[PDB]
Write a protein that binds this ligand. Sequence first.
Ligand code: CA
Ligand code: CA
Ligand code: CL
Ligand code: CL
Ligand code: CL
Ligand code: CL
Ligand code: KR
Ligand code: KR
Ligand code: KR
Ligand code: KR
Ligand code: MG
Ligand code: MG
Lengths: 386, 386
Amino acid sequence: NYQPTPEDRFTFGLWTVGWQGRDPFGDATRRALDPVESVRRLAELGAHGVTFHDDDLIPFGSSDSEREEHVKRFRQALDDTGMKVPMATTNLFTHPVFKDGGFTANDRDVRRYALRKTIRNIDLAVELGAETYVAWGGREGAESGGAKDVRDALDRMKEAFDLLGEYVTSQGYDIRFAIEPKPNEPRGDILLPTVGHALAFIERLERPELYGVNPEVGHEQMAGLNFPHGIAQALWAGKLFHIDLNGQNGIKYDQDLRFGAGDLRAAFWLVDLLESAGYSGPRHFDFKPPRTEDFDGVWASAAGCMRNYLILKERAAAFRADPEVQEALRASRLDELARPTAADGLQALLDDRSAFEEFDVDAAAARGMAFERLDQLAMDHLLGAR
Amino acid sequence: NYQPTPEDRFTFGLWTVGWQGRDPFGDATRRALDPVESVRRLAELGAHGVTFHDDDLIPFGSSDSEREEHVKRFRQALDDTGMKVPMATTNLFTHPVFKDGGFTANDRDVRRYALRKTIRNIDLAVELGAETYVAWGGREGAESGGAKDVRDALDRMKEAFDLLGEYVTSQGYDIRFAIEPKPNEPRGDILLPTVGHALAFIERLERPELYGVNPEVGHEQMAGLNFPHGIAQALWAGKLFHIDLNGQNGIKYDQDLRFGAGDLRAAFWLVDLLESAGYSGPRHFDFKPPRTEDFDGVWASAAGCMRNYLILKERAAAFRADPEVQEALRASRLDELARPTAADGLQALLDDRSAFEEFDVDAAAARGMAFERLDQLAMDHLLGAR
Ligand SMILES: [Ca+2]
Ligand SMILES: [Ca+2]
Ligand SMILES: [Cl-]
Ligand SMILES: [Cl-]
Ligand SMILES: [Cl-]
Ligand SMILES: [Cl-]
Ligand SMILES: [Kr]
Ligand SMILES: [Kr]
Ligand SMILES: [Kr]
Ligand SMILES: [Kr]
Ligand SMILES: [Mg+2]
Ligand SMILES: [Mg+2]
């Protein structure tokens, strides 16, 4: 049951199933995985495709010849299984040179290098068919207040993204950019910490239409925010270009648990929203099989990601299809929220005595919203207890 | 020492010093304050002005004659003291009619009422000299996932703000709007939860230039975010129209402690930023003298708000003026952060071998940022331990 197939558009980063298990207080527990093995094993599990940071595919410091060898064998695995590469990104956080950031490093020479490293990988991403190029500025930020002048840093971040937009436009590439927010970790505070901050920043870019967000479940939850609400705002703005799915148990270090784990109810409301809105992008998992696991546990956790999406999809569909739920939505006036407040116009509203002078505030206040019955029907559907 | 005077632009909400101390677990500990007394006492402490919600000044449900008497008395106190009213706002959260929101209530009749209530108070705020009209949508949101279709709610929120923009433009008013974010409380999750989300939302309004943010220290801190960073993004966007100052001790209920309390280092970096950026708006305190206090404690707490801003202003100015700090900023390359990354342009950057092939990544990585020395000089200045 709940068997994933390629048309579900489930994708995984090479760094996810390939995570060797090095955490903040521990050494690796698993050997490195060959990207070719990951492509084949994920295809066998029903995945649609894979994603990568430049340095996941090509060892940092590779010569052109070595680079070609690594890419060629990866492309052969893609050609053999029909696996796609819908998104790619740059590693601007592992190497010690990026200790104070890539695009917003205080050192100007580092900022220039970060852009050149990014541009090289945009070309490769385009060759492999990526539709979205993600940017996760994990080193952009500070541990102390005087270390980073944030207005200057935002000028530098805008400059970098504007140069990247000029580059893709000049080359005639159709690829678009997606900024992936995170509030903290590895930096004390990271710039553009939430979906909101990233959406706002994009509106200051020279070509805003080329940029959207790649929200990650766990990242918004690291700020204690409601992920489904943030995704609704990104959809409302026309900016949900991609999404990173995983689990997180509250406000703490970035867990990257398999999707479904962590906040289960939020996962249900997220899937309900993605399916009801008709999101058509990749269902990408950015997760880390816990370091307690061996390679069998790695594939069992990857399979669990997809399985939980599919179970939740079925429950959300059953919830929305239930006439008792549609009745409860009407009882809670969900449909009334879709009606314009004042399509009659400002003057009409001002002249409408029923909107103020003769408005029965006490009768309106006494009307229960019936949200608890609605939510218990949602709970019953999620648990299969109807 | 550190005596506030009117040109410091310190302002207070009537509801701050007037908070009777009622919380959900306890009854009022202080009698209601007459707004006239608050105006007089705040003026004696060196305040520049006061702000109000409609219902703080005019009891909800007041007749026209009652309304006129309350406004007349308040105007007389302002006239007598010279106190200004730079900002006002609407109470769209106390009355039970707003239990599911004002602008985004599921019930359409409540949304219309919320707009009429707001428009009535905009006229009064303009007459009293306000430059900014704040909106805190404290009831906009949900406790459960199915209760609110967030995309429809954002359509309704946009419609409401667009109608208010149409209204002030039709009347020829110069007043501007400021959205005050909060992530949660009183709702399980509130819409437009952070500075970022509000900034992004403003870019979808019909007349974006009329709207900015009114960020509150404690509210961004309720999401564990860096308040100075969020203020820097608002300044960078040209949207810091007003600000709410207070204290908060981490991730918990909204404390509204006096300014300086809570995260003291963040208060220092905030004042450093506001003064270095030349923010010219009100330094508004949205605080609650703890309910442990009597009226003497209310005025001591209000005085402490202003005193702490002035101490921090002195220490931030001494920090920035110190030649040893200017040297440390150079050692940490804060000056390089202000230089464009690639004003030579994209083609020059692509052709620059010093930015890629010939970039000595190990030499750059070996350079210490010297951020700890810089931060310890900041600590020494804040504590007067130089
Ligand atoms: Ca993560
Ligand atoms: Ca507050
Ligand atoms: Cl193991
Ligand atoms: Cl549910
Ligand atoms: Cl008392
Ligand atoms: Cl400090
Ligand atoms: Kr990027
Ligand atoms: Kr922004
Ligand atoms: Kr408003
Ligand atoms: Kr938005
Ligand atoms: Mg991610
Ligand atoms: Mg406030």
